[PDB]
Amino acid sequence: EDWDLVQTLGEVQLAVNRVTEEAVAVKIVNIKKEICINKMLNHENVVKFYGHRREIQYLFLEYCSGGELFDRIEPDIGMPEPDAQRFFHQLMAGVVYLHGIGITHRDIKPENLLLDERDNLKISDFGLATVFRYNNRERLLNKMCGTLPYVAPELLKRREFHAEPVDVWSCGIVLTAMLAGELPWDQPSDSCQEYSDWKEKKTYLNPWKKIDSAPLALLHKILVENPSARITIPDIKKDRWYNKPLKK
Ligand SMILES: N#Cc1cnc(Nc2cc(NCC3CCNCC3)ncn2)cn1
Ligand SMILES: N#Cc1cnc(Nc2cc(NCC3CCNCC3)ncn2)cn1
């Protein structure tokens, strides 16, 4: 029952059980909603929730000893393509799970993708998450949420938008970062030159130039401005690169 707070992780601290030496990440601090959503979650690519205690609120979450995805990405380089595909497969498994229970994360980015001791990816931090489907009825979102370089263009231009294509978009930005070690634009607006260049298909420029034609073809289907025309996850699962055997 007793835990030693060993060190700050980033507040979030590492706790180690006095008896078992099992480790847990303790988050100290909307929060009521974060707990409610966490209580719903159980999937191998989602950070585990062990429970909470009110004292200051404590959330007891999975300690992922492999660190954050951010740290497997070499600036301006990315990571080996087979590694990126594996992480991407795991990301999709996690997102499919969340969307299946009607939850959208709304802030997918490498800082929120942690790695366990076997480098299995875990989606982390449900502080911005919300319900988008309940009793089989979808509700459109309208709140501004996320992180600009990862946010889908419809959030900036539309009053309401579907939740699922927004998470799909951010996963595409994550994939870009894994494959090129750089983010494509400050934000997806017409005022953003890099974004305009993408819309005009200038893929001879960075970061696209660094990306092989197969994963780039997938990115062409994900980073589509019209969310209604944007590829869905069941179709990502049928993508050629997605299903390409890769070996380091
Ligand atoms: N600090 C602190 C703290 C952490 N977990 C608490 N409750 C738990 C903890 C827990 N941990 C079990 C796993 C077992 C495998 N290794 C990581 C921990 N399972 C269920 N409830 C209570 N207080
Ligand atoms: N919300 C939330 C959350 C934060 N850290 C968790 N576990 C960690 C966290 C960690 N480093 C601190 C994180 C690193 C990513 N940005 C937020 C703080 N290292 C190992 N395991 C689990 N859930």
* 1-74 topology per CATH: Phosphorylase Kinase; domain 1 (3.30.200)
17 has which bridge partners?
3
Active site residue 107: yes
For strands 121-123 and 133-134, give the pairing. unpaired
Resolution of the PDB structure in angstroms:
1.8
Ligand 2 center to residue 47 CA distance, Å? 9
Tokens at 162, concatenated? 């579907």
Ligand 1 center to residue 42 CA distance, Å? 15
23 has which bridge partners?
16
Q: Do domains 1-74 and 75-248 have the same CATH topology?
A: no
Burial of 204 (0-12, 13-18, 19+ CB in 10 A): exposed
d(C-alpha 93, C-alpha 71), whole Å: 21
Report in angstroms the alpha-carbon separations of 25 from 3, 47, 129: 11, 10, 19
Report in angstroms the alpha-carbon separations of 32 from 36, 38, 52, 244: 6, 10, 11, 42
| Domain ranges (residues) in the chain | 1-74, 75-248
User: For residue 128, which of 107, 149, 143 has the smallest C-alpha distance?
Assistant: 107
Q: Of 71, 76, 83, 107, which residue is the catalytic one?
A: 107
Report in angstroms the alpha-carbon separations of 19 from 16, 22, 90, 117: 9, 8, 33, 21
* 75-248 topology per CATH: Transferase(Phosphotransferase); domain 1 (1.10.510)
Exposure pattern of 144-166 as b/e (b: 16+ CB <10 Å)?
ebbbebbbbbbbeeeeebbbbbb
Can you tell me which atom of ligand 2 is nearest the CA of 66? Answer: 20
| Secondary structure (H, E, C), the chain | CCEEEEEECCCEEEEEECCCCCEEEEEECCHHHHHHHHCCCCCCCECCEEEEEECCEEEEEECCCCEEHHHHCECCCECCHHHHHHHHHHHHHHHHHHHHCCEECCCCCHHHEEECCCCCEEECCCCCCEECEECCEECCECCCCCCHHHCCHHHHHCCCECHHHHHHHHHHHHHHHHHHCCCCCCCCCCCCHHHHHHHCCCCCCCCHHHCCHHHHHHHHHHCCCCCCCCCCHHHHCCCCCCCCCCCC
Q: Tell me, what amino acid is at 179?
A: L
Residue recorded with tokens 């030693």 = 4
- Residues with CB under 6 Å of ligand 2 are 9-10, 12, 25, 27, 47, 61-64, 68, 111, 114, 124-125
